[PDB]
Amino acid sequence: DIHRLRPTSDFKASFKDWNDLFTCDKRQLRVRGIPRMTRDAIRTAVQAFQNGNPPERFDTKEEWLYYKQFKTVDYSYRVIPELPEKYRPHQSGIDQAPLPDYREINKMPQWAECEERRQ
Amino acid sequence: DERPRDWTVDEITAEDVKRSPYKEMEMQPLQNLAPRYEARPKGYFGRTYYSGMK
Amino acid sequence: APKRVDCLRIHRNRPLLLHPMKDNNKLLELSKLPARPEFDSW
Amino acid sequence: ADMHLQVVETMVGCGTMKANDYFVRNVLRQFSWDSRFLEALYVEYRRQDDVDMWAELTKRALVWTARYNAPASERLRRLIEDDYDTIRVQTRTFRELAVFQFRDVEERRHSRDVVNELPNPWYDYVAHALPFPDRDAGYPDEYGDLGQWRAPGGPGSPVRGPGYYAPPMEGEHQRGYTAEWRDLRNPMRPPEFPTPWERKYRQYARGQHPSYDMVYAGPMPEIFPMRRDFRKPTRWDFHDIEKQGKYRTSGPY
Amino acid sequence: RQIRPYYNLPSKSEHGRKMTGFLTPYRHWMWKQNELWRNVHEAQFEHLRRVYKRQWLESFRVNADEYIYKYNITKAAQLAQWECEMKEQ
Amino acid sequence: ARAVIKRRSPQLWGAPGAPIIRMRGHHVVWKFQSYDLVVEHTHKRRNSDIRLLHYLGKHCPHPQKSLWSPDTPVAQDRHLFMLTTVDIDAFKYWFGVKRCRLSMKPWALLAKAGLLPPSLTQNSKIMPKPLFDKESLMRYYLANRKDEDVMAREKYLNYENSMVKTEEERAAERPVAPYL
Amino acid sequence: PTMVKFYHDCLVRNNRPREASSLMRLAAERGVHGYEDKWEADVYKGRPLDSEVMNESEGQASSLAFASLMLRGDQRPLPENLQALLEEETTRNIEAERSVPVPFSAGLHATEINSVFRPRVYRQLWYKWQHIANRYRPTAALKRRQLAPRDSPTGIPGFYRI
Amino acid sequence: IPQEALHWLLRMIVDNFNPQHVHYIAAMKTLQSAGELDMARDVWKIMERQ
Amino acid sequence: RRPVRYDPLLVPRTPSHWSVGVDATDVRRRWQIWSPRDPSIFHETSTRKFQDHLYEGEPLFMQLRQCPWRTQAKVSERWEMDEVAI
Amino acid sequence: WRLQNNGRALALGPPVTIEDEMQSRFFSNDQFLVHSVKEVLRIVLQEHKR
Amino acid sequence: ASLRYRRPYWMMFLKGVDNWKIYTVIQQPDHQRTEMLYQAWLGGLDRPYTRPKCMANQPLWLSKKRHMLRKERLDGPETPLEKYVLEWHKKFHSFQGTERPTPDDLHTALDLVERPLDLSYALQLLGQCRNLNNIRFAKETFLVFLEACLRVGRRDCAEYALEHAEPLGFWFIDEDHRRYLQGEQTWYKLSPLDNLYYPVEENAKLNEGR
Amino acid sequence: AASSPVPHIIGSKHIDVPREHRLRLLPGMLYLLDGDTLPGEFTINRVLDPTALQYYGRLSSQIVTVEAVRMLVPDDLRLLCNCITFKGPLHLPVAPYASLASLRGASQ
Amino acid sequence: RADPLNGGSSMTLGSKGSKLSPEPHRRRMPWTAAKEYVPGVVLNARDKMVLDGVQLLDIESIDRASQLDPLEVLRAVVATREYNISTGKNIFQLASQATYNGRGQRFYRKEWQEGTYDKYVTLSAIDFDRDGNKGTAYGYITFHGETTTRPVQVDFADVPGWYMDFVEERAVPFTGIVPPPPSIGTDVPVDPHSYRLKAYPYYDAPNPPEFVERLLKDRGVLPDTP
RNA sequence: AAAAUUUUAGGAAUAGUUAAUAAUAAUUUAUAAUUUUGAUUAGAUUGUUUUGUUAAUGCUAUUAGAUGGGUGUGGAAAAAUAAAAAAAA
C-alpha cells in the first residue's frame, strides 16, 4: 500500500491467509469484488515477490498530497505559486510603512536599569 | 605571413591545416563523420509489394 | 480546507463545443460597455 | 612515441632496471603512448626482488593506463593474468567475466549437443536485401478499369492512362499506350520481358495453364437468395485487405 | 522507473520530496549484482545485432552482383535496338 | 520539453525519438483484436500522414484449431495454432544496420520465432537470479581462457565478412590462361 | 470607462504612477463600471508636484534635491557631497536601463502591443448576433454554425475583421 | 566494417548511377587500408563489368 | 551442478523450503460444445468458433482448467518420479 | 589530470615518425628514380617478411 | 520537476523570491502601475522608476542606495562604545561588503566597555565575529574579555565563558585566569609596570609593599 | 629550454622597437633575461594575491623557485607585460647545449 | 558518445545508465555535466532544537530596547556555534581554526575513505566572503596516489561534512606557495611500505557475507523466517 | 524549394505592391506586378482514385484531423480538454 488511488490495506480482511493471497487469480479477485486498480496493484506486488522483489518502496501519499495544493496542471512535482490579486503592501490599505519610534526603542532595557541600580 | 599555404586560384582553402598541399595526397578515410543509411522508404512499406508506388 | 461546455449537435449529429472566449480580446469589453452612452448610466 | 618505445624496449632487454624511470620521465606525461610500453615494462617489473614491489608497479601501471587514456592491450592483460597465482591482480572487469562465463558454458553445451546442430533458415542468412523483387509478379497494370476516372494517377500510382479510350496521343506516347505499356488483364500473354529475356520464354508466354481439364473443387454459388455483399469480420484471415472492396462478379459460374 | 526503497536516505523537507536518491551501501552492492545479470542478456543482443548487420550486407552484395550482371545485359540489348531505330529514322 | 506535458503518455527523449519495434493494436473489441508488429519512432507520429517507418507483420492473439491435421502428422500437430507474420530481411536491417529499439511483446514473439533469445522479462519463478562472485568468475576464466588468435578469428567471422575465400578459391580466381 | 482605460494606459506608458493612481482613485470614487474596486492608497500624499519642485529650483537646488527624492521615514539623508554622487549614479543607471532595446517588442510599449481599436460600427452585426445566439453565454465565442447550417451563408458578411 | 565501402559502391550502381574513377579509387584505397585485398579485387571486377 | 556442470550459485537449485502452488496434476477436464443448432452460433458473425471460414461451431472440444486448491489441504506433497507406464 | 591535444595545435607530441616529403607526381625524374629504388627495396622487404 | 518551460528563461535557478508569478505578468499596464507605486512606497528615488523587464530582485545599485540611505536603528549614541558600534556597522555591515573583522578590531571594541549595555553590545559583536564572520580569536582575547567583564562587574558571564570557551572561540585561557574564575585564587592578573596585583580588592591584601 | 636550444628565447637586452610599432609587435613576445630589470614606461603591480600565486606553485617547486610576479601596464593600458623572476638554479638537469645553460642564474 | 556504458547497448532504456555521457548532453546547460554530488538537503537541514530555548537578536536591530542580558548573549553565541556545526563542520570552519589558514593540509569527505575510495584534496588557497562559513577554496586533488597538476576549485566546499588532520610539517606560510603533493607513482618512486594501492582499474571488492546473506534472503533462497 | 489539378444564377479591377541592386537592416533605378485564358474582396467548403448507385472515364459522399505577440526556451513550438500510450534498476 504505497499509492493513494490503489489502497491495498483496505482489503486485508478479504484474503484468508498467505496461501490464499498468493494463489488468488485476477478473476478470483474480480469475483471477490476488489476494484481494478487495487487488484492490479496487489497482483503486481505478488508477482514481484514471486520474481524475488519484496514490496519495499516509498509511500508517496504524503508527497503527492503536498504537491496537490500547488495546482500543477499535469502533476509534475513542481512548485507553481498562485498570484494573489492584491499582493503589494501599498494596495492592501497601508498608505506608508510604519515609521518606528526611535526615541521609544532607544530607551535602556529593564535588565540594564536593574544592573545600573545594583551598581 | 597571412596567406594560407593551401591558397590557389580556386580559393578552396582548408583552414587549420598545417600540411603543405604537396606533402600529403591520398584518399584518407574520414573518422569525424558517420555513414548514413536511408530510413524513409519510398512507396513500399511492407506486406505485399504490388506495384511499389513509385 | 472541470467546468462544463455547452454542446450543440450541428449536422450528422456532430457535437460543436462553444468554448469561453479568451479574456484578452476586445469583444468581451465591447459587450461590457454600455450600448447607448447618452441614455444608459455609465 | 615509436622512438621512445624502441629506447624503452632496449633498456628492458638490457635489464638496466631504469626503463621504468625513463618511461616515467620522458614518455608518460608528454606523449600519447600506447599499451606496448607497459607490455615490455612488465618484463622489467617481473624482475623486482619483492613480489610486493612487483604488484605495486603493476597496479601503478594500470592506474597510468586509466589516467592517460591508454587502454590496456589484450596482450598486456594476458601477461598480467599469467601471473595471477603470484600477484593476485585482476585484469578483467566483473561485467566482462560474468558475460564470458555464461557465454562459454552455453557455447560448450551447444557444441556438445547434436539436436540443435541443424541449420536454422530464419537465423542463418538474409534472403533478399534489394529494394525491388527479383521476379515479375505481374504488377503494375499501367491501365485503368471500369469506373476509374483518374488515369493517370500521378504521384504514387502506376496507372499511366485510361483503360479503354483516351484522347489522341503523339509519337512515343501513342506507341506506349497502344503497344508497349504493361497490360495485366491480357489473357493471352503476360507483359513481355525486355530483350533478350523474351525469346527464351517464348513457349511459356501463351495462355494461363495447359490443363483445360480442371475439376472445380470449391463451394457452389448461391443462386438464391443471391446475397450481394459478404463483409464478415474475421480473426485469422490475412487476405482481408484483398477481400474487402467492390469487385466485379463475372465468371463461368 | 527508478525504484525508491523505504530505507533510502530520508530528506526531512516540507518544501519538496520526502525521500532522496541516495541509497545504502547494500543497495549499491545489490544493484551491481542485478546489473551483472542484465549484462548477460544484453551481450547476445549486440552480438545478434552485428551478425544481422553483416548478413544483410552480404546478401545485398550477392543480390546486387546478380542484378548488375542481368541489368548490364539488358541495357546493352536496349542500346543496340535504339541504335538500329535511329539509323532507320 | 512542454509547458503542460502529456501525463498519460510520456517518453524519455524528444520527438521523433529512436525507431522502436512494437505491436500496435487496433481500437476494436477483444473478440476481433489483432496486433501489427511495426517499427516507428519513440513518439507516435499520429499527427502526420506517415505513421510507421516499416511494416513487419501481423499477429493474431486468438488461437485457431489445426486446419492441417489430415496432412502429414507430427508431434503436437493437433494443438491450437497462433498464426502470425514477420518480415525477416526488414527486421534484420532495422535491428542491425539502423539499430532500432525493441519492446517486450515483440521480443517474446520473436523469441518464439527463433530470431532472438527469450526476453529479459520471460523469467520463471523456479530458479532465482544468479549471484556473481568475482573470485569464482576469475578462476573460471583462468581455467577456460581462449586463444587470442582464435577469439579474434571468431569475432571477425561473426562481425566482419564471413565469405572469406580459401586458397582454392583464390587459385581458381587467379588467371592461368594467356593473359589478355 | 473607455476614456478612463485609455488615459490610464497612456499615463502608465509615459511613466506617471502618481497620475495613474489619482485617476484610479477618481474612477473608484465616481463609480465607473469595472473600477469600483481599483482603489489604492495615495503614496504621494505629502510630496509636492514636479512642477512645484521645478519652479522652486528655477527660483538652493542642493537642498531641494532632498525634497525631490522620496524618503521612507526610516530612510535618512546623507551629506550632500555624497548625495550628489549617489543621485548621479542613480540617473546614469536608470538611463542605461531604459536605453536597452526590448527584443520582439517592435519598439512598442506593452499598452501599444496588440491594441487595435475600431468603432463599434465595424462589429455591430457581431454584437447583435452574439447577444442572440449566446444571449445567456456572454463569455462564449460567436462561432459560425450557431446561426447558419453547413453549406449555407452566415449572417455577417465580413464576420471577424475583414 | 570494411565491407561497407563495397556495399556503398554496389548501392551506387543499383541506384542507377555511373561510379566515377574517384569512387573506384576511394573504394580500393579504403579496402587496402583495411586489408581487404579480395574486396579490392572485387571492386576492380565491378569496374570492368561496368 | 558442481557433459557440462553449472555453478550452484549461477544456477540456483529451486529452494526446497518453498511450496508448490499448482502442478501438472492439478488440472481438471472441461468439456464444451458449440452446437450449430443454436442460431447464435450458426450466425456468420460469431466468435464462438476456432474456424474462420470452414464452418460454424465446434464439436465437443475439451479444455483444461486448473485447481489451485492443493494448499488448502492440511498436508500437501509432490513426488518427483519418472513415468514408468510407457 | 593530463595534457591533451587540441584541434588548433598539438601538445602531446606525435606517436609515429612521418617523413616530410612530396608525392611521387611532384618528384623530379632523378628524385623519382631514387623513390623507385626505395620502393623496390620496400617490396623486397615485404616479400621477405611474407 | 523543472520550471524551464513554465516561466521565462531569465528566471533560471530562481530561489527565495516572494512570488515569481508577479514578474511574469508585470508587463501589463496595471501591474506596471502597481510596481511603480511599490517602488515609490519603498522610496529612495526621485523619479518614477520600474524594475528591469528581465529582473526579479532589486537592482544592485538601487539596493545599495537604499541600504546606505536607511537610518540606523540606534540614534544618539551616548557612549564611545555605541559610537564605535555604529562605525562598525557602517564599515563591515555595508551592502555586498567584502572586508572582514580582525582581532585587533574586536579588542578595540572590547576596550570601550563601560556599562552593562556596552558589555552586551560588545558580546553581540564578538558573537558575530565568531559565527557570522568566522574569525579566529587572538591569544589575549580572553584576557580582554575578562577585563571587559570586570569593568562592569559581571563574573557569571566570565565563568560561563570559561565553562565552555572552545565553542565561543577562546582557544587559550591562562591558568591563573582559570583558577580565578573557578574560585581557586582571588587574584586574576599582575600589572608589571605598577608591580601590583589585580583585582585591587586583593591587591592590598597580597602586595602590601611597592 | 632546459633540454633544447630555443633560438630567440634568451636575449642580451630588452627588445628595442620604435614606439609606433611597439604596440603592434610586442604582443606575443616572450624572452628571458638575467636580473630583475623591468622595461620603462610600465606601471608595476606586484601580484601578492595567493589565489593568483597558487598557480605558480608547481612551477616554483619542480622547475625553478619563483621569487617575484609582476604585471606591467603601459601608459595607454593596451600592452600588458608579465614578469616572473626566478631565484636559484634549475631543479631539472640542464644539458650543455640547452638554451638555459647560457644564463648565469639558471645553470649555476 | 565519448564514454558510453557497456559500449553501444540499447537492449533496454535502462541499459544506457542514468546518463549517456559525462559531458553535458546539451551545449546550453553546462551544469548538467556528470560529477559526484552530496546530500545537500540533509547536510543543510540543521537541527533547530539547539536554537530553541535560547533568545536571538537580529543583526539589523541595534536598538537598546532589543538588547539582551550578557549571559543570554553568551548562551546565544554558543547555541549558534552548535547550530552551525550540528550537521558537520565546513571546510571553511576547519580552515578558520588552523594555522596558516590550513594551507597545505589535506581535507577529505566522510565517504572519500571508506571502501575502495581513497581521495583527498590538498589545500592551496582559500578566499572567505564576509560570511566566513562560505567562500571559495582551491586545492590539489589526489586520487589513489595520482595528483592533479594545477589547483582546482573544491566542489561542495560550503556543504558541511569535511574532515581534516592538521600536520605542522605540511603548513605553508602565506609568503610562499603551496607545493603540489608528489605523485606516488610518477613523481616519487613506488613503495609498497609507504603507500599501497587499495584498488587498481580492474579491481572489484569481494562480496561481503552480510550483503550476500541479505540478497539471498530477499530473493527467497535462504529460509528467512519470523 | 518547384510543375499540373482549385467553388459561386444575375462577372471587375487588384495593391506595404514587380524586377534589378556594391543595398544583411534597399533614402536608389525602371516604360514595374496581378487580371476577362476570369484576378482581388465577399460567400460556401479540411486539397489528390477510399461512399452510394449504374451497362458506364456519369452522377453522389469523405474529421488525411495540418501555422506569426503566452514564455526566444529548445535540435525542432505544436506548448495549458481528452483520445487507449511504458517514460532512463
Ligand SMILES: [Mg+2]
Ligand atoms: Mg478561380
